[PDB]
Every structure is written in structure tokens, then in C-alpha cells.
Design a protein around this ligand. Structure first.
Ligand code: SAH
Ligand code: SAH
Ligand code: SAH
Ligand code: SAH
Lengths: 219, 208, 219, 208
């Protein structure tokens, strides 16, 4: 092969990124300046408001959440801001999404965490409702925390989303889900979520119509 | 003319729609020589809704027709069908379309080149080409012609034209395309199959 | 695999591009607006003055050069502007460079030629002086034209460069080489080039200290 | 402490420099557990130029020392050597360095963590760490620490310090690094091996 940054090899195994359209966007969380490649004006991944909210919550509740060495999975990670912040806070982070997102997700993770966080993040395809037992078998993959931000949108496969949330929530797992409430379907999803998860409203961000929920699975 | 691309990997695949047993020559070496999940769902819809749609004698254009199953089904149902794709796809498209429609549908279907967003005014002038329906299946995926695709869909959508678009949803970009489609078309979800991640939409061009 | 633009699969097989540093630069040659990803301020490939000069020559001498269906190889192609222009003019273009250049080279070629030129360009590693018989055997790879722009720079392996130029110049092959004359080593290389190639000065670009040479191999 | 990374793929590789037969434990699973072409060329240079360089009792730091061949050779030649790398590389680096220098060179070499550009003021204060030579081999390649690398080279280059840097040239970025190195160091090409694409430079920090 070529003598390159070894992390770049995993990047080469994802769908390529249409980078002409992507620009460097700057954030600051958990004491660090963060740079995210996003495609704001054309096709490609972007940071959503739910991410901004969840990142604020994580930086502010870091001591309580005890992310140091926690095993974390993010569903619908997008460009990766939340997974980056979780990694800065010391978690073992697996960031997941659809195949066209994974390259830029991995790139963003590398650019913000390589040799400067406790654990190198992992990037993996996870299509909601598909191949869960095959790729994320409960018996081999317990997560202390499952993160999700702005994964509820009317055109997504939302029962597959709920099924995935449930699948990844074992006894002890804490699910942190932030969303902007844009449409009636979002409200309807919250009612479905509350039926199966013991649900707590942790924070409200009225300025962005974002709410942050904790879900632990009812026994 | 059109001659099929000379693949050594052609297979004869067997389908049944609108009451006819249909054979489609396919090759995995080209997306356009493969029947995709959107095609199956759209064929099932056309077969089940033929009465409502009044395809009898309707003028229809299919974009990205690939191996031609949807165009065959539309011809079987009595439409005047124009099947379009990239120049290299046309040979096998015409072969399949003719094998399945010659002397057995109401109207012989036509095959024409239509590269998305290229020379639409010159190749398909509105002064002479009006479609009652535009059909599209599995044309949205992670490729570099998404804007040109939407432009083409808009172009072919004169007032009165109905667009029927089926697609498997695979990529973040597919959802972005859907959002852009809804900005320009009054959109109705006709059917959804979460197991196969397929949606089928009607689009009517917005004027307001 | 994934249902993606099929050209993107070849892109995934090259060293990844550090795209945060790359910006879209605009050129106009051979009647077309061209967009090139370049890394001007940091590590990554850029367009050199020799490219600008050679592109001007190609657009202006298109009829004479008869690039339609010509088999062309570019050595040290960089971000790919020259190979793009050659492809627009109708040539079968093989663009070559060191492994860290090939991804962005291929990307630039795709963004400017996919479904809009006569022949899809090829991208291949070609390290000067290495693996020539193995990867570009004269008996299977005859080129009508070999292109090179600003490939002469003092810190490169310039005898390996000359050896490569010679290797790729069969009877009938026309070598078009543009360079800015920056250093004494550049002048010295020109003297070496003239010793082995029948050399003609085709054009001088005094405004950028660029000269464009034709070389045909002495028999 | 430092313990070698637990690879199942360690091999015992055999070198001869400065008159000693040297054994280096290597693993292809880490760049830092492999001897690279720059190392060989730099060792050959140090062996051939030892008289001129007055390494006897010289204080020397190696950055990116990897499996430690260059540091071993420098110790053999009588220098006080500090070998540095990433924390995961240090175990095998110390193992090799000790196996080859314990009770048989003038000065026992030291192994210390030095992640390029990280906490240099805190970990290697100038108030207490002056190197007569800084050594580096094959530390330039297509990685995301090139600026930090150069910063580190500059940091360790106090007035009087000589930097010796050997490298295989593989990538366009390697040449860009060389251009940036020459902006900040008065640079001399000590040796060049086109067949193996290796160059060896001396750098002295510029003040003018
Ligand atoms: N069925 C599915 N499987 C996996 N991911 C999906 C999905 N449907 C949508 N997604 C992903 O969910 C994300 C929603 S957008 C939110 C992105 C990110 N969490 C942020 O807040 O910035 C997108 O990245 C999208 O690709
Ligand atoms: N830029 C472009 N212009 C015209 N057709 C294109 C195109 N890009 C892709 N296509 C065509 O779109 C099709 C996508 S695959 C879908 C084929 C068929 N509709 C089915 O569902 O089975 C291929 O036939 C491909 O050749
Ligand atoms: N030994 C070698 N083998 C292959 N390419 C080399 C090389 N040494 C340098 N190069 C390449 O030669 C190019 C010189 S810069 C010129 C780039 C381009 N032709 C333009 O004019 O814009 C770089 O892309 C560099 O990576
Ligand atoms: N950011 C960083 N800080 C410190 N060392 C680094 C580094 N990035 C890479 N390295 C080290 O640089 C070395 C490059 S390989 C060269 C090893 C040795 N000098 C030889 O020539 O054989 C590896 O040991 C690697 O661990």
C-alpha cells in the first residue's frame, strides 16, 4: 500500500465525498475548536440544530454523564459533530449512518480527534432496521449511551428508526435523543417513543424549537 | 439503429406484469441493464391502477428506462411509450422493448437518447412533444447528475402532465433530492414499502 | 457495493484527498468553464503556470494537433487541468502522477468530463523511472502525444524524468513540454533534453517566464 | 516503564552498522516497528562521517525514532541519545535500544514520548534540553502532522544545533514539505540516492 496516515485506509473503503460542494464550518464545544466539512448549498451532509443542542448538553453535563471510556453509538451521525464532542469527552465512539455519509463523517472525526482524544472513533454503516443482529449483535455490542440528533424527519423510515433505538437499548443503556419539532409526524413519533421508553425531558432549546429527551427501556 | 452493448454476462430474467410473461435481458455490468426495485414497485402500481390512469392511447416518456421493464408494462397497458436513457443503454433497451411488444401491444414503443439536462430544447421540443405521463424508477442514487435529473423532470412536466417516480432510498443524498423535488412539484406519496425502502410519488409541477 | 456513479469506484482506490484545504478554482479553456480543486495555502496539489501556457497552446492549435481520438499520456499531471483540456479536445487521456495526487486528479477529471467528452480519461500512478516496462510496456502503450507542464523543478529526480520522457516517446510520438525557467537546473535540463530530443520551441510566454517545447526522438 | 505492543507478527531483523551486528525486532503492523529506507541511509552516513560529526559525548535527540536503528547507531558512535516517538511505539523502541546498547556504548540511551508539536515547552524545556544534533528519518510521508513535524524540528533547533533529516520521497506532499523546510532552515543536500528516492539533508535554523 502507500505510507499514509493509517486511519486514511479506512476512509478509502467508504463511498467518496463530493468535496467541491463542502466547506469548513467552525464550532466550539467541550473546550475545543472544531472544524466540520459540510455541504450547505448543495448535495452532501450538514450539521442540524439537534446536534448543536445535544453538544451543548454533553459539554455541560460531562461530569455527571461520565463519558470517560463509555461505549457510545450515534445513529444518523451525519457530518459527525456529536460523535466528535463525545470523543473529546473521552468516550469510545461508534458513529453510524447511510453509506454516502460515512467518508466525510470519518474524515471529520479524524481531523478533530486523531492523537488528541482518549479513544479513536469507529465509523460503521448502520441502515435503520437492517442487519442489526448481523452487524451489531446485542451479545457483542453493549452501549452505555446511544446518541441521536435530528434523526426524526417526516420522510425517513421512522418505525425502522424506533426499532433501531429499541434494538440498541439494553438494560442500563441511556438513549439521548434531541430533535427540532418541525412537523406533526415529529410529535407523533414522540408519543411512540414515550410508549416504549421511560422518557424524561432533559432540556428545551426554545430558540431552535429543539427538545432533548432521555429514554431508558421499560422493563 | 441501436445495438446492445457486447457483454459476455447477459442473463435472461423472467417477470410477470399486467398479465404478460416478460423476458428481460440483463447484465450486472451496467446499472442500465439491470431491473431495480423501483421498477418492480412502479410496474405493480401501473398494473393495479390502469383503469384510473387511462393509459389507453396516453403519450408517455420514461427517463432512465434502463433495460425497459416499466416501458414494456406501460406499452402492454396501451400507452404510446418513448423510452429514454444514455446512448450505451439504448441497444439492450430497444432489444427488450421490441422482444416484448412487437405486434402485441396497441402502439409500438420508441427508444430515444435523453441524457439528463442535455439539449432538451433541441432534442425534445415542447412545440412537438407532450407527455400525459412521465415515468421514472430508481433514477435517484449517488451520482453526479441529480440537478440535471430534476431539471429534466421539470422540463417534461408541462401543465397536465403527471410524473410518477419510484425509488429505493439508500443515501442521505436521496433524501436531499426528495426535498428538492417537493420544492418544485406538488407531491403525493402513492405508496411506501419500508421493507425494501421504496417510495412511489406522484408529482405535478407547481405554479403556486 | 453501493449504487453510485460508477467512476467513483476508481476514485475510492486512490489515497484520499485532504479536502478541507482544497478550494474550487475556475478556468476557461477550449470553450468550456472548468473547475479545479486545488490546495493553494496548505498541503495538496495546485495548478502551475506551465499548465496555463500549455492549455492556451492546445486550445489555439486544436485543428493542427488533431487531438480527436489521439492517445495521450500526461506525466506529472497534478490537479489535472491539462488532461481535462486534452479530453475536451477529444483525446484518449491517461493522466499520471504520484499516489497522493491521483484521487483529486481523478475527481477533477470526473467533474469536468463525465458524459461531456469523447473519451473517459484514465488515471494511473506513474513514478518517474519506475515500473515502466511493467505498467506501460511500449508494445501495448503507444502514445500519439505525451504532455508535461512544470515537471522540471530542482528538487525532483530529473534524470528519472528524462528517462521517462524518452521511454514514452516512440517513433511518431510528439512530446509537448512547458516549463517556467526558475533555476539554473531548469536551463541545464533543457540542454539534456535537446541532446536526446529533436527539440523545437513552439511558444514563449514571457509574462510567466514559460517556454513550450516540442520534442521528437532523434532516430 | 514502557512495554512493547503485543503483536503476534514480530520478526528479528539483522543489520550491520558502525562495526556492530544489530538485531531489530520489527512488525509490519506499525510503521514505528519497521526500519525504513531513510534510516538505512542516515546510519550509513553517520558511520562514514563519525570523525567529522564529533558524536563522542554529543547530546542527540531523534524524532520519530520508530524501532530505534538510528538511535542505536548514534549510541554506538558515542552520543548521549534521546529516542522519541508516539506512546505506543516506545515499548519496542526501548526494547531494541536496550538490547543493542546496554553495557556496550559510552552512554545508555533514553526513550521519551514526543508527539510532534504537543507540549514541547512543558515536556522538553530549552531551559534544560539542548541537542547538538537532532536526527530524523522517514518522518515525512502522507500524514496529518506535517506542520507539527516542522514546528518540532524548529523547536529542537536551538542556535548551534544541527538537524540531519533523511527521507524517501514518495508523494507530492513530501516535496511541499521540503519547500517549507527550506524556508526555515539553511539546507544542504548531504546525499541523494535516486534509485531509492532517498535524500539526506542538513538543516541549520535561519535567522537570516
Ligand atoms: N434509514 C436510515 N438509516 C440510517 N441513517 C439514516 C436513515 N434515514 C436517515 N438517516 C440519517 O439521519 C441523519 C439525519 S440529519 C441529522 C444529522 C446529525 N445527527 C446532526 O444532527 O447534525 C442523516 O445523516 C441521514 O443520512
Ligand atoms: N445522466 C443520465 N442521463 C440519462 N440516463 C441516466 C443518466 N444517469 C443514469 N442514467 C440511467 O438511469 C438508470 C438508473 S438504474 C434504473 C433503471 C430502470 N429505470 C429500473 O428501475 O430498473 C440507468 O438506466 C442509467 O443508465
Ligand atoms: N518522481 C516523480 N514521479 C511522478 N511525478 C512526479 C515526480 N516528481 C514530481 N512529480 C509530480 O510532478 C508535478 C509537478 S507540478 C506540475 C503539476 C501540473 N503538471 C501543472 O502544471 O499544474 C507534481 O504533480 C508532482 O507530484
Ligand atoms: N505525530 C507524531 N509524533 C511523533 N511521532 C510520530 C508522529 N507521526 C508519526 N510518528 C512516528 O514517525 C515514524 C515514521 S516511520 C520511520 C521510523 C524510523 N525513523 C525509520 O526510519 O526506520 C514512526 O515511528 C511513527 O510512529
Amino acid at each position: 500500500s502507500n505510507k499514509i496516515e493509517p486511519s486514511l485506509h479506512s476512509l478509502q473503503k467508504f463511498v467518496p465525498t463530493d468535496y467541491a460542494s463542502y466547506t469548513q464550518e467552525h464550532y466550539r464545544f467541550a473546550g475545543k475548536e472544531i472544524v466540520i466539512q459540510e455541504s450547505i448549498e448543495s448535495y452532501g451532509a450538514v450539521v442540524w440544530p439537534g446536534a448543536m443542542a445535544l453538544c451543548q448538553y454533553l459539554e455541560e453535563h460531562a461530569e455527571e454523564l461520565n463519558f470517560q471510556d463509555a461505549k457510545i453509538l450515534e445513529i444518523g451521525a451525519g457530518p459527525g459533530l456529536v460523535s466528535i464532542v463525545a470523543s473529546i469527552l473521552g468516550a469510545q465512539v461508534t458513529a453510524t449512518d447511510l453509506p454516502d455519509v460515512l467518508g466525510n463523517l470519518q474524515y471529520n472525526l479524524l481531523k478533530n480527534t486523531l492523537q488528541c482524544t482518549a479513544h479513536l472513533p469507529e465509523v460503521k454503516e448502520l441502515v435503520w432496521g437492517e442487519d442489526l443482529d448481523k452487524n451489531f449483535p446485542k451479545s457483542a455490542f453493549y452501549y452505555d449511551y446511544v446518541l441521536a440528533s435530528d434523526v426524526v424527519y417526516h420522510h425517513y423510515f421512522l418505525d425502522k428508526l424506533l426499532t433501531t433505538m429499541v434494538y440498541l437499548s439494553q438494560p442500563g443503556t441511556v438513549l439521548l435523543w434531541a430533535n427540532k419539532f418541525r412537523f406533526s409526524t415529529d410529535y407523533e413519533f414522540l408519543d411512540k417513543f414515550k410508549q416504549v421508553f421511560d422518557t424524561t425531558l432533559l432540556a428545551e432549546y426554545p430558540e431552535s424549537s429543539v427538545k432533548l429527551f432521555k429514554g431508558i427501556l421499560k422493563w
